């Protein structure tokens, strides 16, 4: 319903999925081989069955496609400081989907307006899918030609012969904790001959 939807929910309409008693079929996506760049490190066949996180606490953040490989220790920036701090545990599966090619329409795509900057962060122990708008100027001119106003809605530049190097990437963090809580299933087994 989500990964195979044509009109994909945009970056400002993402949804958090609560997974309970459901075993994700990693052997399907991880072995799909549709994406050549599988820089996913952390999964092993001998430890695959024990990855039964009772409460999946996964965090998501946003970074530009060309800046994903520009991450080095001892460097800071406002993009990381405004959405979610990146620790030294950046090693993880890069769950990146290519939906840019599936959102092409006749007459140009001028309704897709991304929001790179958010007022606050995804606070722990709380859910927020609000659509608050932050303006870059105090006094509004409301489109009237004048001073002390700017436009935050950047043109997409969706030329038909434009470059394909603007593919976004997102990485999630999966850490296991053994708290005082029960469990019932951790993984199935394949029936023999």
């Amino acid at each position: 319903e989500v990964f195979n939807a044509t009109r994909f929910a945009s970056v400002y309409a993402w949804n958090r999925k609560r997974i309970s008693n459901c075993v994700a079929d990693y052997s399907v996506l991880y072995n799909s081989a549709s994406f050549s760049t599988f820089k996913c490190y952390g999964v092993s066949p001998t430890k695959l069955n024990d990855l039964c996180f009772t409460n999946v606490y996964a965090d998501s953040f946003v970074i530009r496609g060309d800046e994903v490989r520009q991450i080095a220790p001892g460097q800071t920036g406002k993009i990381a400081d405004y959405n979610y701090k990146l620790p030294d545990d950046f090693t993880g599966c890069v769950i990146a989907w290519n939906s840019n090619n599936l959102d092409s329409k006749v007459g140009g795509n001028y309704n897709y307006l991304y929001r790179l900057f958010r007022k606050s962060n995804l606070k722990p122990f709380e859910r927020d899918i609000s659509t608050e708008i932050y303006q870059a100027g105090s006094t509004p001119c409301n489109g009237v030609e004048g001073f002390n106003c700017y436009f935050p809605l950047q043109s997409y530049g969706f030329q038909p012969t434009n470059g394909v190097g603007y593919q976004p990437y997102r990485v999630v963090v999966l850490s296991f904790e053994l708290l005082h809580a029960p469990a019932t299933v951790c993984g199935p087994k394949k029936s023999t001959n």
Partner: protein, 260 residues
Amino acid sequence: TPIKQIFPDDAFAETIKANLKKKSVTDAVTQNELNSIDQIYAPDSDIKSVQGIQYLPNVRSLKLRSNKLHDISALKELTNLTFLFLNLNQLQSLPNGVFDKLTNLKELVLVENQLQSLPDGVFDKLTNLTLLHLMVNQLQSLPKGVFDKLTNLTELDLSYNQLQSLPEGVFDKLTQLKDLRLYQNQLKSVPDGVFDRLTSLQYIWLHDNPWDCTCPGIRYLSEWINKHSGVVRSFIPLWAPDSAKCSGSGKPVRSIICPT
């Protein structure tokens, strides 16, 4: 040999002890290990005063935070401060001569500055910069031929500014106009001498621009782009064929006799 008297202030000593997670004051460090230290963690920095840092000019990572000090004129004698990464508009006074010595900086960005007098000729001799920022600029007049030898313009970020006009014939030697957008702007003058040899152009940008109807200047180009009206679109939801309307006259096309 013992080294003491490092922290004159009593409260600053406790602040440094808490920030640098040093339990005691009798520890020993070496120069080579500190020089390799490219990460310093000083959370909850209660740095009220700057006295005592003058004797440590061999630090790679720094930390500065002051919400009351608006006179930072002490920066003239301060040689080792490179990490100036803060976002606050509470600084009303802007010190003069900040750029005279600040060449040892690694990263420094600044926005929403109240610089009333931007010095002319910043790009005179310092051509070693790779990533140049032209953020919140106010240069109203440019020297003639200031960008003559600077034929190395590859990365251009000119958005997010209060640019008003452009000089007559600024992009003359620049025959590689590749990617630029001109919205939310108040352009007054179009540069000349940029379409004389640019007859083999492959990218042209005309949207949201007040082309003059003065005959016989741009009549040929206007008619040619009008003949291909089936490709050009607009931002507002209005009848596209009616957009191409010259201002003032209102008479039909065939009834216009171009003088001279």
